[PDB]
């Protein structure tokens, strides 16, 4: 075939029932995660393909950058729930990657009042028990496909994406085919 198993995907032996429709994983310490949303544009040009009707999640992972890694993903819950993953993905990446002024919970917090969010309002988000299911369920996503390692997308719970296997030398070409394959999974 053009698209086989173990090449630009691999098939989970244990698939997951109920699954979301396209599942990425990222963290906002993963050097290649910073590359999928600040350079390759990912998620977006994944959507730009995917059929519609198709459900598109995003979910943080608490196993890289230890305590800031959990408070991180405590923020993304947080940017779930207010709608405003667009407003702040980017600068949490810089102040984690780039000029490193990420260094305790209050500094994820300042990104969000330098984005607009209102102190008051990240502060009842932060605490609030929506936000601990949102962080369950972002840990339980992760648990549910014995994740390891991220960048990660899981199609239908069953198709894991492989990037390993596809050319590198071009980056508009890594995406489109990226993409397709994403759009190939989805329509298995």
Known sequence: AQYEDGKQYTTLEKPVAGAPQVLEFFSFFCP?????????????????????????????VNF????????????WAVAMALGV????????????????????????????????????????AWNSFVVKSLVAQQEKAAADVQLRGVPAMFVNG??????????TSNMDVFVQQYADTVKYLSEK
């Not at 919970?105 to 607009?116: C, L």
């Open 32 to 60: 290649h995660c910073y590359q999928f949303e600040e350079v390759l544009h990912i998620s977006d040009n994944v959507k730009k393909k995917l059929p519609e009707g198709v459900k598109m999640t995003k979910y943080h």
């Open 64 to 75: 890289m950058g230890g305590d800031l890694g959990k408070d991180l993903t405590q923020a």
């Open 85 to 124: 993953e667009d407003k702040v993905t980017v600068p949490l990446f810089e102040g984690v990657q780039k000029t490193q002024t990420i260094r305790s919970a209050s500094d994820i917090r300042d990104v969000f009042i330098n984005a607009g969010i209102k102190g008051e309002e990240y502060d009842a």
């Open 158 to 167: 069953k198709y894991q994406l492989n990037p390993q296997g596809m050319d």
